[PDB]
Amino acid sequence: YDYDAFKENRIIRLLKTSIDLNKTKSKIRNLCIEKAVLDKILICLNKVSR
Amino acid sequence: SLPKVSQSVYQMLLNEMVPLAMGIERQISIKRLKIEEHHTVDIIRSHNLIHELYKADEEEKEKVLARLRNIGFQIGLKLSELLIFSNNPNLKFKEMDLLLIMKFICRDVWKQIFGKQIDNLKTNHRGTFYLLDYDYRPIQSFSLEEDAKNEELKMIEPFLEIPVGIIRGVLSSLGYSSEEVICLASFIDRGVSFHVQ
Amino acid sequence: SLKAMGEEIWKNKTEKINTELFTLTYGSIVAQLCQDYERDFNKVNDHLYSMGYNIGCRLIEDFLARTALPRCENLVKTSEVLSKCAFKIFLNITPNITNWSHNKDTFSLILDENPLADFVELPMDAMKSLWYSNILCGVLKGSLEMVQLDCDVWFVSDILRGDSQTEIKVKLNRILKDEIPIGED
Amino acid sequence: AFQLIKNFIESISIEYRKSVRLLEFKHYFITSMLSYFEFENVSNPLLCEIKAELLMLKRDNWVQGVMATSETVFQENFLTLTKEILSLFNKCEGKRQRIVDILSIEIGLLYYQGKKYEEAVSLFLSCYEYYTQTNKNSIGLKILQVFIDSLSHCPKLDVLQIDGESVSASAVLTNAFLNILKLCKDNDSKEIWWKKFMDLQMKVHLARANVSAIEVNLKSYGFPEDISTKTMRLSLKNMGGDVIVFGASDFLLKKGENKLILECRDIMYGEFSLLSFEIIVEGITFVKEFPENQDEFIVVPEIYCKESTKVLVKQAHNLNLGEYALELKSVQSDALESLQVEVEVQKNIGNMKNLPVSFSMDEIQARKRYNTPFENVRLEYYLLDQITAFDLIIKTSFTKKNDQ
Amino acid sequence: LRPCFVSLIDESDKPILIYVPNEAENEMNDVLKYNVLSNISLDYFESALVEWHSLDSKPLLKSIFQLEGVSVFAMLIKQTGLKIVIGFEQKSLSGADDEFEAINQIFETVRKIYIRVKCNPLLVSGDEKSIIKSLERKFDELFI
């Protein structure tokens, strides 16, 4: 969401979802550490600022 | 006669496979917690689990209601052989008519689950037999708040999907798969309705 | 004392057949959890425990309604009433009490017959992954805390997997209190 | 009342304690023959002949038991006359159609006791399999075990004209059915001595059903510009084979046909292959459903159409681990639309072709949605043309020949 | 009194079990005998000379034929279509009626022990490996 990319924040995502993306990541051959880092990055960018 | 156990534990078992059905569908694996021997088990109880069906997405509710008739299907087609060993005379497997097995079920199954007959049976002669009982046993003890009677029938509507499965099971014991619906159909003095297909 | 009053409640109670029902019902709702999870067995114990909890918490008020009993405190009295007028009233059976601990705490609950695993044969893939009658640990853990105790129950062995008996090793860990009816002024 | 006479036939047989005297009770069966004339009131009817034939069958069984202490070949030449007469009597206008097949097999067991003559059981090879239809786990094993030595022994390969299959195809189907219905450990001599002939006679036009050897899947990985492609584990049923087995994953608009191989030496159970695949289609798309053919070509396409619509959704996505591919980008452009395509090049070189795909003809490199195919190209520029252009599709089929 | 084969046939004419209770004998020598007798005994259920009436709770026994010195006894229970056929050797029969009723309680044991594992509430519903290999370890318990 780029409306607050230049008002007191940057990299603040809009209202998408993550359970279907996690199901797609589980349905491939992704390892537990890579899914841990990717779920941590998407969890941080669920609501963030810069 | 037979060895016996008490009805009040069975009826209270029979009331609550619908919290078991939403705890098997919603939990694919405000909710609470408990512990055992270096473990934990996450618990959710029945008042906060039938009320997730008043706020149910429509494919989720219709996914649940297949499971209630699947439970009824398994207990019906397992029950019919032991009721055959009870007596079950004078009927056959292919069974060209239908009233002689509708005379069977109200006298022979519904006494062994609920202690009385299906006291009304209406005969559309092309094969739609209406089975009406007035005071159904497990729904003797359910009521909503102070005159909010409209919003409880649609709340309590999963609880009649056990005798969908019972009459599916005792007819798949005699051959085939059929089509079933339910009604409420209140009395005339001091209700429920089932079809056949 | 008790066993006279247990048969006295077995003369004014509503009854039905324990064969051809209720083993069917409990076996059907364990076959659903067998097929619903999709043939995994160490999870169905932790759903049958969480279902037996909710069915025990409401049973305890019916059992105190049928027979007028005080709040039990020691494990002489709970172990006497569970062997004499709880299982006798509800399920027509009675257990026996062995394997008693030191300091009057943790005992065993050997069941002679069992009208939940009655005439059931268990398949070979669950010899070491399933507890069959683990609604009983649900009703004991969710029923003994509602007389303001706090316990822990677990099966130790079963007739289906093992020649040794069906026994539940119930442990007293602590006794809960009654709470004072405000925080403060 | 004949049943009452059968009770009379149950009576003296209850009171039998001398087998030389009880043959005189077989003469009482002759008296039942004197009841067989005394039960007849007409020429022919369905229920009358059906009641008539059973006493003659019991008398035929008593006459068979009469020779228990052993007329040199007169019994083995003459009992088939009474047996065929009883089968013709019980073939009268009722559905008793397992008496006919069992009586024909009883005649065939005496035909095999002679020289290996003209066959009726193997001529009705559909009936020979139809005894094995209702999962007859024992009768049809012998009803095929006699017919296998009958077709092998006769050495004249012009088959019957129910369907003219005048080759080793019927005996190969018999060998496959007898190996399928056998025991596992004790059927090595049954396997090898009938698997050896189809090697030399490789008619080799067979489409089996794969009940002998089973299969199961696993996850899917990558390789050196190749797909590891669902490293399957198979079962075992026999000694060995040599098959170029390939599975067939198929999406909602294409078919991958991956998991191929060339050689196989499967002898042990839990076969646990790897099945490395080239020609990775659909950019390794995730919606590739399993048509699950697994056509293990052990000198015959012994396929298994393991189809459903279960939506288990074998995903098997791509990876980029320094292998040659091609991309698409349109940077450094002028003030009109274009496209570009750079390839992570390597030694071996072959062709590629790009095509537009929309409901209308959105892009147009030519007047129509052209190809612009090229051999050994690193980067270039392709233009476009006029439509309501926001976002079009593409497909860049690249026969790279870096693999085979 | 002790049988030489038992057999159970389902709603169709598909056999559920053709079981020999003296299992690995010196005179095994074929399983064709006690199999073609069952295949003809399914055909003797639409023979018009014998007939099973349809009024009573207790279905009835019959004495259908004898062959190879083996008597068969069969009972169509009318509700689950279950065609159950047994055989005995010829001179184990005494001709009396106490052994006839002992044969009837052999049926009332084996019908009971089949409908018990028809109601074993952990199996998947079908004629799998499990049902036959449970029926044999109960029939070895009944017949030594």
XYZ file of C-alpha atoms in Angstrom, chain B residues 98 124-129 196-197:
9
model
C -42.321 -50.267 1.097
C -48.274 -41.372 -0.903
C -48.576 -44.474 -3.043
C -45.745 -43.606 -5.454
C -43.136 -43.973 -2.692
C -43.076 -40.956 -0.368
C -43.861 -42.182 3.146
C -38.851 -41.639 1.796
C -37.573 -41.782 -1.780
